[PDB]
Nucleic acid binder design. Sequence first.
RNA 1: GCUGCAGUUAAAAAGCUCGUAGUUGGAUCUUGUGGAGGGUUCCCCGCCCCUUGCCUCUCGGCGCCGGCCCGAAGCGUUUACUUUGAAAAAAUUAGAGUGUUCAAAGCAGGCCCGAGCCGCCUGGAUACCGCAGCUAGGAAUAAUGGAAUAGGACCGCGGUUCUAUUUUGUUGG
RNA 2: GACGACCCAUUCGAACGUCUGCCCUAUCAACUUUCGAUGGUAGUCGCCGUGCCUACCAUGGUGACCACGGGUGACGGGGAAUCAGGGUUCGAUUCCGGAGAGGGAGCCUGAGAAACGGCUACCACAUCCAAGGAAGGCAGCAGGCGCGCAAAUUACCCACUC
Lengths: 158, 129, 142, 263
Amino acid sequence: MADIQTERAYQKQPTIFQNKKRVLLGETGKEKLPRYYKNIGLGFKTPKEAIEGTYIDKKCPFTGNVSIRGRILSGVVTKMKMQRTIVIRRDYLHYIRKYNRFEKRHKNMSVHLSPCFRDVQIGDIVTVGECRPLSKTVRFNVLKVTKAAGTKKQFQKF
Amino acid sequence: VRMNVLADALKSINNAEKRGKRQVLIRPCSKVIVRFLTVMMKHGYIGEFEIIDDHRAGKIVVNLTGRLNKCGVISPRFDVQLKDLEKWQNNLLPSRQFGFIVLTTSAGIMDHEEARRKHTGGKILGFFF
Amino acid sequence: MGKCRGLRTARKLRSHRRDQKWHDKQYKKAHLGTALKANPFGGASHAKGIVLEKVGVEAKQPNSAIRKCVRVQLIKNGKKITAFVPNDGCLNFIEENDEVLVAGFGRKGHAVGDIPGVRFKVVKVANVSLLALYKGKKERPR
Amino acid sequence: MARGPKKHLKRVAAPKHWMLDKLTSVFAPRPSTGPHKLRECLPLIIFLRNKLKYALTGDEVKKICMQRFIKIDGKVRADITYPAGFMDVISIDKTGENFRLIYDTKGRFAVHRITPEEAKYKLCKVRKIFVGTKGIPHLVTHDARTIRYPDPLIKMNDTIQIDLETGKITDFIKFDTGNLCMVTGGANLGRIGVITNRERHPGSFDVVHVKDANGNSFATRLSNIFVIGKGNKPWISLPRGKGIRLTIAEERDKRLAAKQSSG
RNA sequence: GCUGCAGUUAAAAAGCUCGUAGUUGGAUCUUGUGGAGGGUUCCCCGCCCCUUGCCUCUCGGCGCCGGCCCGAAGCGUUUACUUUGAAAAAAUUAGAGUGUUCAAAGCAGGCCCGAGCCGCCUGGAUACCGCAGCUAGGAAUAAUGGAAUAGGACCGCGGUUCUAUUUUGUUGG
RNA sequence: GACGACCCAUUCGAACGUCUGCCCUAUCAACUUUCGAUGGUAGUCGCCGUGCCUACCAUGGUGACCACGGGUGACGGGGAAUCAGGGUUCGAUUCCGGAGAGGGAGCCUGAGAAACGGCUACCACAUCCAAGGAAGGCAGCAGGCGCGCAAAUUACCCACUC
């Protein structure tokens, strides 16, 4: 919040510039930084916390340098010990045709999760879309979070 | 424990028919059992029947006419498509001239000859002849 | 008697069959490869070898005879075999320290009839067939 | 190994609609690089040798072309494997005849003779719209033609008419409901009908529904629809059978009843 | 041996009991009269209580002498299943036509005077193409979900903080 | 008219990435990890995305729904034999995709090659010599030796298909 330059190099959004002319503000002041953000398409909506926020993240869909294309998928949040990335589980049934019967299977995906989502928990349901390769094992990025079709965080009044 | 109620209902009728008894009692009752009995009754294999309310799922008494050779259940409710229904009636029926497979479909529970007129597939429940 | 029937059981069914195939005597020896290392022909239908020694083996009771056989060393492995010589008087064609072609006796590695422990038979001598020698169509070139 | 581009074509690998025999040979003509895709063209050698039968061998085709007799879209072409395709005109001024390439209703190029005043224009589907330096607008067609200064009403998926002596636009048809079209790919290839609905998806493919003259209905991906007339009337003459696609039982019955094929 | 085997005595049930993963899991929550095709009541319209369950806009054609109506859209709690569209090399296999002298094959071939016809007619079908992904109808069966530390809703009110910077004649306040 | 060249768009492609799909094995139960393993920030290199590589920092990632390790007389697919219904076995082989030119490595030219009917060196074979030196790669078509139960002529032609 109050400081974000925790790295050895200065952190800023590309395409935003601050004028060093007409700088007078009197006894008070206003934000020296305007905010860059965009529409993703496909009927998704941009979070309020991306527009009203102050974080820097180049891999963010709403406020960074990525294009959402190809497949849209969903899965269950299962681990989150990395920084700005999480692991999600996908479960399915496989048909074996000699018998007339099914077999249970799973796979894991590592995905990139930006700030603007900040109340996610293990067992939440998440929707993701493809990007260019973002790191060695990461190809997908979080577009929406939900806990519909399931029990509450704490008691039923949540 | 009791994993399936329709298998009890048909095994209970089948043992009573083979002893030559004129009535049988089925317990517990279910929406699936009442709809299956109705398909046998409409084709002429059993007499009329009566339901007892007891505030705990209920009971049925059925009247038997001596015509029934067998009735039975296929336990996994396998899916069937119109192209594969010929293989099932070749396996389960005694002749091409008589006997019926019973299916559940989104148009209702029905006779395998009606499923061809209605152009629909479904899941298998059982059979009678 | 108790076989599982549930609609998601395919992993239990497929892997139990796979495990139980290894109790069939014919399946096991075809798939372990120990029988293919042991067999004195390396999976062939026939082999060539050189005649060491001519021998007579006593037949098993309830019958009585001396069965005419040869002991042979195979060219491609250098290992040792004994083989039967079919028909009346054919042992006179064979000589010693020369090539025979040998074949199986008709029971896929098991012995045949009253002859104890013999698994093979002679079919060709010095590049002429025993049938062509026996029916007088050909002779040994010397 | 594959260290660069390939330059041969095996005869069992060649496009099915060319109708090549099985036993004369191992190879087929590899179409020359050009305005139409390898799967979607007809090489000039197959038209002169196999369709029109003016030549018995590839050498008799070579010595027709080197005499400068053959024109495609009004230009003389000496290349025997040149990739001609849909809506092109071929003119043979020495025999006095003109052709246009159009699909038969079984999904293959028909021979279709045309009058010399209809041999003066062609129809083009729009592929792209863009702005170049100094703000000049550009257009691109299905056959690689580039046009400067198009009319600002001409949009994506529309059909334009061009005169072949000058290469400039004369008139156009808008893509909208009720207009006549022909199908240029998929299983419905070579059918004709009116556009009756467009169903759209953001990402992946749009789907168009089309209605026949006999009242049959069929559908395809938007990339397979070519518009050929405003309302009910086409801007080009059409081949025998007019795109109606009768079934194998109707085709049997007309073949018995009409006694055609020298019965 | 899934369909489809066997385990008292022929080969074969852990000495006995608990228990995590795996497989399996009880009952329950909207129907009959009327019309068409067809019968002598049930499958399509419209109804006891809801029939696309709601809704009211606005860019955008219809019906008529502005206002009120009827096709998109928000979308119907989420999936399996089933039925239908689309899109998937050829050869091979199945399958239609056709007297290679018959057949296996092949993709041909058939009419007419004589040669004065400067020729004419016609084929090179069609089906199948698991699973996984895309798509539009059906809603039985099987999963899954809502208010108990009360919240749905009314053109319903009130304090307070942030705030786009439209409508005004514009550039600035 | 012919030839030529910078830049757009085409055509023929190539390269990198997404989702789902595999034969036997526990006398293979835990594995990977600045000797980069999983992720973050800045950069280098490259046709371009990316631990591709470097510096600093974090402590991650996969497994009984079989990881990690070992075997395969394992090139994959279209397909083939046998077959009431369900299956079992096979696929080096004319079409499509991949890999390789005795074994490993390096590189020139070019739009395209880490090329072998191109080059440089080591390792294994081996030819000629005036002993100083020089030259080499049939898993192309014929033909030969060796191997083994086991496989054709050192023929004619660009007439056809390309």
